[PDB]
Design a protein around this ligand. Structure first.
Ligand SMILES: CC(=O)N[C@@H]1[C@@H](O)[C@H](O[C@@H]2O[C@H](CO)[C@@H](O)[C@H](O)[C@H]2NC(C)=O)[C@@H](CO)O[C@H]1O
Ligand code: NI
Length: 532
């Protein structure tokens, strides 16, 4: 026919609401970052953070590592025809500093100010030395000053008719069950783009998705698929996948729970170690993930992808509390004083109050929902009372930000080194702020761990970063802050019916996933060519 439509699935929803504000990650559509608002630079995390220069053509840190200058590409246009300039970068950083609810990554902890040098150069000043700061700066969306500076309230603006810098800005069709986002008519990198539109169908959960993917309806996806070789891969020789190793998954407990009895259990080190010993991590991997994961027996969560970074003395000291041992969990509850005093057959708190733990995972994430149900059975076998909850993602996330939940099962982002995990999962600076994600929302606050995390990139010296890692690894392991379970996979399925050029095990160019927060998806769509 006359245009290519590439069918993708970045996020499950029951109905689409029209919201393309790139600062509102808890309520927007997940083709806004990258595809509407292109970054300054994309770093290829699977390949050493090798840079790909996009809206900026270069950057340079100062000698003292307290500032950085970015060079803006000349001849780039916004989708309405206006020039992209340093003014747009200065405006967007000043907006996130002034309305801190729009900071989704912690940038206001690192950047104190932003100066225009001229129309094509911007200078950033820092609170503290950070050789990794260009990677942090590239997370922040840059929007057009000429539109956003006239909006009454950017933190409530739904941006229904977006003006963007990236490959797909035109809202061709919008309905609550399907939308189609087509090529920016002034795209600066039009010569490299061979896809006309993204086609985004509404899919609520993994059972609805399995029906569509088995029937060949999808092109680019990253959902959990049960029994994948016998269901999806067996339906057609056009159906393919590639699952490179991803990050940690853990049970996270709330140290500020407002119920006195639950707070007494969750904040007790012995209780978190007994919870951890009750679990059988390899059975969770075999049943809930059909084998698609690796045990994580690091109290610190570090994981076997980063075994070369481990202090093995620390790993070996706490490994027994992160291995299956049901008898040991019963003995530890008894020594610590979690005794059944009300005769209901479950342990009560040291003060003698009865409690039950409510363990949440998101609606429709069936691999995580099954993991929690297996853990609730394992926990009952040592006398710990728990039950599963499966809230909608927006309610799951809000309950973490507000400190209203008991325990949550979650994964984390995965980087080129351990900092992406440790900093997002533990820095107390990421516990306050209405735009922050859920990952640090346990409310365990330790200023000495924060000092070590903040020191990791004060130089670029990797031998010193390995010693700083050993300190971080020891503090988290000795306090058993969360209960790590396994290291997961970057789930990804591609179809060769309508497009070619896909990344895969023989073409392993970068993280291949379609989710928001994987900025390499802009690089991967620039490699795709229609066959129909
Ligand atoms: C670190 C992180 O938050 N990753 C999120 C992805 O896990 C999530 O994808 C969903 O993962 C569930 C757990 O493995 C799968 O059951 C589910 O099929 C999958 N959903 C899709 C649409 O791929 C994505 C999307 O919710 O958000 C990432 O941020
Ligand atoms: Ni450890």
């Amino acid at each position: 026919a006359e245009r290519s439509e590439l069918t993708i699935h970045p996020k499950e929803f029951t109905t689409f609401v029209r919201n393309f504000n790139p600062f509102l990650g808890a309520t927007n559509l997940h083709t806004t970052t990258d595809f509407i608002y292109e970054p300054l630079v994309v770093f290829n995390e699977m390949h050493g953070n090798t840079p790909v220069f996009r809206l900026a053509e270069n950057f340079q840190m100062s000698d003292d590592l307290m500032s950085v200058t970015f060079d803006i590409r000349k001849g780039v246009k916004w989708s309405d025809g206006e020039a992209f300039t340093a003014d747009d970068v200065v405006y967007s950083f000043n907006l996130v500093k002034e309305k801190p609810e729009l900071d989704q990554s912690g940038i206001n902890s690192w950047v104190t100010g932003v100066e225009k040098v001229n129309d094509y150069q911007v200078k950033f000043r820092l609170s503290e030395a950070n050789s990794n700061v260009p990677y942090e700066i590239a997370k922040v969306p840059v929007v057009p000053k000429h539109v956003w500076s006239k909006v009454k309230d950017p933190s409530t603006f739904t941006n229904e008719n977006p003006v963007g810098s990236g490959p797909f800005t035109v809202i061709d069709t919008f309905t609550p069950q399907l939308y189609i986002q087509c090529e920016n008519p002034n795209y600066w990198d039009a010569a490299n783009l061979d896809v006309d539109c993204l086609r985004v169908p509404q899919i609520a959960n993994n059972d609805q998705f399995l029906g569509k993917v088995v029937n060949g309806e999808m092109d680019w996806t990253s959902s959990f698929v049960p029994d994948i070789d016998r269901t999806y891969a067996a339906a057609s020789p056009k159906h393919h996948y590639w699952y490179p190793p991803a990050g940690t998954q853990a049970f996270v407990v709330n140290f500020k729970n407002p119920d006195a009895a639950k707070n007494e259990a969750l904040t007790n080190v012995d209780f978190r170690r007994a919870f951890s010993m009750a679990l059988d991590r390899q059975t969770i991997i075999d049943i809930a993930f059909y084998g698609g994961g690796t045990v994580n027996d690091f109290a610190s969560g570090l994981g076997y992808a980063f075994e070369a970074w481990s202090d093995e003395k620390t790993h070996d000291k706490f490994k027994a509390y992160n291995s299956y041992n049901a008898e040991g969990a019963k003995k530890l509850l008894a020594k610590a004083g979690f005794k059944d005093v009300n005769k209901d057959g479950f342990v009560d708190t040291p003060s003698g109050k009865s409690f039950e733990l409510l363990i949440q995972s998101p609606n429709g994430w069936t691999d995580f929902n099954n993991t929690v149900q297996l853990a609730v059975e394992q926990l009952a076998e040592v006398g710990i009372k728990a039950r599963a909850r499966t809230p909608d993602f927006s309610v799951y996330n809000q309950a973490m930000l507000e400190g209203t939940y008991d325990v949550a099962y979650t994964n984390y982002f995965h980087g080129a080194d351990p900092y992406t995990y440790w900093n997002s999962a533990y820095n107390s600076a990421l516990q306050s702020g209405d735009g922050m994600p859920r990952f640090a929302m346990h409310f365990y606050k330790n200023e000495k761990l924060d000092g070590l995390l903040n020191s990791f990139y004060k130089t670029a010296d990797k031998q010193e970063q390995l010693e700083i890692a050993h300190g971080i690894q020891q503090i988290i392991a000795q306090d058993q802050v969360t209960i790590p379970v396994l290291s997961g996979a970057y789930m990804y399925q591609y179809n060769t019916t309508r497009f070619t050029g896909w990344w895969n095990e023989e073409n392993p160019k970068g993280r291949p996933n379609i989710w928001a927060g994987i900025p390499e998806r802009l690089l991967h769509v620039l490699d795709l060519k229609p066959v129909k």
